[PDB]
RNA sequence: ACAU
DNA sequence: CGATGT
């Protein structure tokens, strides 16, 4: 129904699927970038998407904050309550660097605990995510 | 079909 | 139009 403006807001970008990915968390409210990964040479769109809400459940974490996450990734948010990135990227020389951070990832998640919301961003009702790359 |  | 996902 209504936006939780007290939020972070994640998103992935990429130059192809499978191609370039990045990732971004912004301050809902406001836009405010809080934090952007260097691009990832190789990687999927739903790998940057889980790898972005497990950054930004870090970055929450770090900072003593209670503040949900919004992603529009149904597949993320699914990656992520399960710990587990379903990806189909062929493991692979050129792939390992991608691999090696949803790998982490996942391990961060099975080590650490948290109670941060992952909501999802109702594109539909709300237009793009505050952290949408805009291509 | 839905989410990207 | 192509691809990644449930
Ligand atoms: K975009
Ligand atoms: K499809
Ligand atoms: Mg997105
Ligand atoms: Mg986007």
């Known amino acids: 129904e209504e936006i939780i403006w007290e939020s972070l807001s994640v998103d992935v970008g990429s130059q192809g699927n499978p191609g370039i990915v990045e990732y971004k968390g912004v301050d809902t409210k406001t836009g405010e970038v809080l934090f952007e990964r260097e691009p990832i040479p190789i990687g999927t769109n739903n790998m940057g998407e889980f790898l972005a809400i497990v950054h930004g459940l870090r970055y929450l974490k770090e900072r003593n904050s209670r503040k949900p996450i919004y992603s529009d990734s149904q597949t993320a948010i699914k990656w992520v309550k399960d710990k587990k990135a379903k990806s189909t990227l062929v493991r692979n020389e050129e792939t390992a660097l991608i691999w090696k951070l949803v790998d982490e990832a996942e391990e961060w998640l ?9 909501l999802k961003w109702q594109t539909d009702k709300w237009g793009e995510i505050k952290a949408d790359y805009g291509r």
């Open 110 to 118: 099975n080590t650490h605990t948290y109670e941060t919301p992952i």
